[PDB]
Design a protein around this ligand. Structure first.
Ligand SMILES: [K+]
Ligand SMILES: [K+]
Length: 401
């Protein structure tokens, strides 16, 4: 009458595995009869491990996943939607901050691909002092942002108004999505068709081009953007919350502000990490996975999970901020009002492919093709004609799907 399941995750660092080992021991203590085994897998090797284990009927019952890869698993039908929805029913949809569960919806809108445990978000980081030393209030829309970037621009001195991604990489697609979605421009419409060559998408693309006249020249990827912000080449930068551990190390957290691209609405990019439960397992394995993920969502356990990356990972469960784990963390206290500001921006999470309560799985192929960041790259670095590049991009996607 004992049952054994596996928890596959990507925390291969010994510190993180120590935290997961104590969570598991706490779980097993409260649920005699259930053993959980760790399966740490480097993020690099995640997909190969998954196809290898699933083609041998040895897929672990519980799997840590980002929301985009959960879409690929759900399309391959590797996810037990009823088990996931059972967990969400237990803790309640109201346990999650608004905007969070929409992102993990299935393509038909009827269920979810996983149970969210954390998120990182992206937006505009800036240096509070430099914007005073220039006479500028923090920007609240496209116009104010462009104006602030122009005022802080100064390329003769190798200083620039904003660090903006422009490379042929997912980072550019993510940061550009924030402006496009702030203009109600999504790559998909509510019927699952590719809607790229649209008026509202052209406006965002035209605005991004104007804004990049104030960024470092050339193809800027993750290292270019981070370096420029960290060494003072630009006092504004679009980046994820993973900049926050670096500000803690190199600089002064008091001096960092955060603003959200806003035009017709506000849009922050976001990546969710979830625990999902896989399909095809014995019923007793499935119920054990259900209890395990439900356990992981209780306040003290979810808080220990999220604090494995303090500053970088945000809580998506409303209970985390009530725990002593959260309020007594040194990193969280060093950041001041920032963690509450960031959590407050979770209702504004928008991503390409998530249209209402449906997240279309063909967005993975769109992203996998690089057409959207390449399009942005061509018009910003290459100086290509914007209207015919947008039109060529629509045609490449139509031909792709
Ligand atoms: K198993
Ligand atoms: K089932």
């Amino acid at each position: 009458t004992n049952v054994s399941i596996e928890f596959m995750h990507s925390s291969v660092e010994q510190e993180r595995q120590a935290v997961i080992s104590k969570l598991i021991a706490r779980f097993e203590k409260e649920n005699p009869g259930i053993t959980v085994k760790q399966v740490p897998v480097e993020e690099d090797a995640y997909n190969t491990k998954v196809i290898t284990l699933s083609r041998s009927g040895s897929l672990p019952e519980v799997i840590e996943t980002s929301h985009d890869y959960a879409k690929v698993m759900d399309k391959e039908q590797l996810i037990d939607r009823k088990a996931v929805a059972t967990v969400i029913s237990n803790v309640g949809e109201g346990a999650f901050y608004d905007g969070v569960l929409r992102i993990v919806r299935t393509e038909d809108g009827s269920a979810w691909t996983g149970v969210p445990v954390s998120a990182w978000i992206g937006g505009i980081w800036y240096r509070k002092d430099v914007l005073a030393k220039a006479g500028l209030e923090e920007p609240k829309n496209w116009q104010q942002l462009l104006d602030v970037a122009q005022k802080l621009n100064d390329p003769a001195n190798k200083k620039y108004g904003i660090a903006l991604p422009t490379a042929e990489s997912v980072l550019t697609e993510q940061s550009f999505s924030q402006f496009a979605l702030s203009n109600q421009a999504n790559v998909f419409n509510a019927e699952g068709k590719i809607t790229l060559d649209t008026p509202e998408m052209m406006q965002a693309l035209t605005y991004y081009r104007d804004l990049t006249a104030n960024t470092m020249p050339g193809s800027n990827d993750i290292m270019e953007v981070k370096d420029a912000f960290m060494n003072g080449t630009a006092p504004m930068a679009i980046y994820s919350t993973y900049i926050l551990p670096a500000v803690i190390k190199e600089g002064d957290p008091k001096n960092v502000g955060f603003v959200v691209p806003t035009e017709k609405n506000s849009a922050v990019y976001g990546m969710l990490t979830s625990l999902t439960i896989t399909a095809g397992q014995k019923t007793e394995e499935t119920e054990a996975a259900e209890k395990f993920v439900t356990f992981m969502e209780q306040a003290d356990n979810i808080a220990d999970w999220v604090m494995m990356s303090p500053g970088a990972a945000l809580p998506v469960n409303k209970a985390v901020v009530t725990t002593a784990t959260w309020k007594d963390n040194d990193v969280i206290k060093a950041l001041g009002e920032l963690p509450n500001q960031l959590i407050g921006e979770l209702p504004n999470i928008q991503v390409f492919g998530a249209v209402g309560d449906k997240n279309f799985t063909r967005m993975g192929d769109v992203t996998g093709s690089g057409v959207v960041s390449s399009m942005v790259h061509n018009v910003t670095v290459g100086k290509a004609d914007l209207s015919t590049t947008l039109q060529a991009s629509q045609k490449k996607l139509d031909e792709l799907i």
